[PDB]
Amino acid sequence: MKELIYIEEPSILFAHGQKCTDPRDGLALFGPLNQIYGIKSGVVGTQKGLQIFKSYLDKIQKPIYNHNNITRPMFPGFEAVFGCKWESQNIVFKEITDEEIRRYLFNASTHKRTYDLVTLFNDKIITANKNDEERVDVWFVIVP
């Protein structure tokens, strides 16, 4: 009679030559393999975006609790799990356009609006990277 053969779950490798199946508890126990510790970042957007990003960035240091523990492993903290520093006091911000001449009066050919948005963002990022001195690693873009 036709029957079902079963296949077991494999294992993944972690730091210190340890093993586990889920990766979350392994990271909470052993951490990553290679150690890199620079998250000097960059950001563009509006000032309310600045304050909200600062609040969310310095909020993650404290542990945050899921509603149900048994299905989601706990998150103690970024420095608690990774051993890498990431704070809200070393950002190099570049200001965004605020006038936004595009309004409800201009809605025909939204492709042109998208082109203008992307051109503005890309030129700002490229100019900031090319001209300034500080060494940035990642660029976060926020927009409603």
Partner: protein
Amino acid sequence: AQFHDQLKARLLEHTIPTQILRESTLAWRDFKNTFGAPIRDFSKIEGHLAWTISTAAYYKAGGKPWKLGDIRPGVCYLGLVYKKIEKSKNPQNACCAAQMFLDNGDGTVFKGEVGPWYNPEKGEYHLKPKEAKALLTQALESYKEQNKSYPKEVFIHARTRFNDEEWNAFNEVTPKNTNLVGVTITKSKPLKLYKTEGAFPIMRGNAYIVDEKKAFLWTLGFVPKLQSTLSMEVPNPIFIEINKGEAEIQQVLKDILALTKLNYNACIYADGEPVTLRFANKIGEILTASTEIKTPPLAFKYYI
């Protein structure tokens, strides 16, 4: 529609990582009920949000979250998927090489191959005999340069079966007597099945062999550790067919099962299809946004 695609595609020429975050994720407080029905909610899931973000950013910094170590040394791996561009003459020609795994003594390689080779046909897919030789030769010198010797065994994934001529050409570009095999992996085929007793679906990891060639696998059950289902309703399995070559079914099946947890973009315990097919699928639309680029990089940090 193409905002992110266009932005990343044109910024790709300057070698700069980036990360796009919608404000609603950050500001999920004040976007509450307009007239009594809340717009938005992450209360129940809030902690997991952090698990979704941090490690991803870590990868963009240059960190390796976790690596798989269940691979036989001295073997190959590769994947492929097509794409429709329909630019001028409704061309169907966009093939994006997915990845390749290598053991350079102690490390693992995850850079893959690139180059959207073209094809005059518009609806038949497949591949003209000229492109395939270069396509396989590229992985060949990559293996030579990252191995300081020649590769031993080679595996290939796909999405659709293919005709005799191009596989014959693939065998023509085979150095020495190495074994080559390609496996076709579909996504949806109806084999709905139920559980006789209880109120829970099938338990993850089962199989149902119909022949020495074909096979099946289930991926959305519920792990006992998680104790909860990975899909809201009853699942749908993946149908596996071996096209050519002499490959044992069980080893290839366990290998393709073992490559469904390397989803660096997230941290969910289980994922439906292997990383390769979806990974090439998500790199294709980056390069189809605008085609003026020449020799794009082969590091997936900038793509993802």
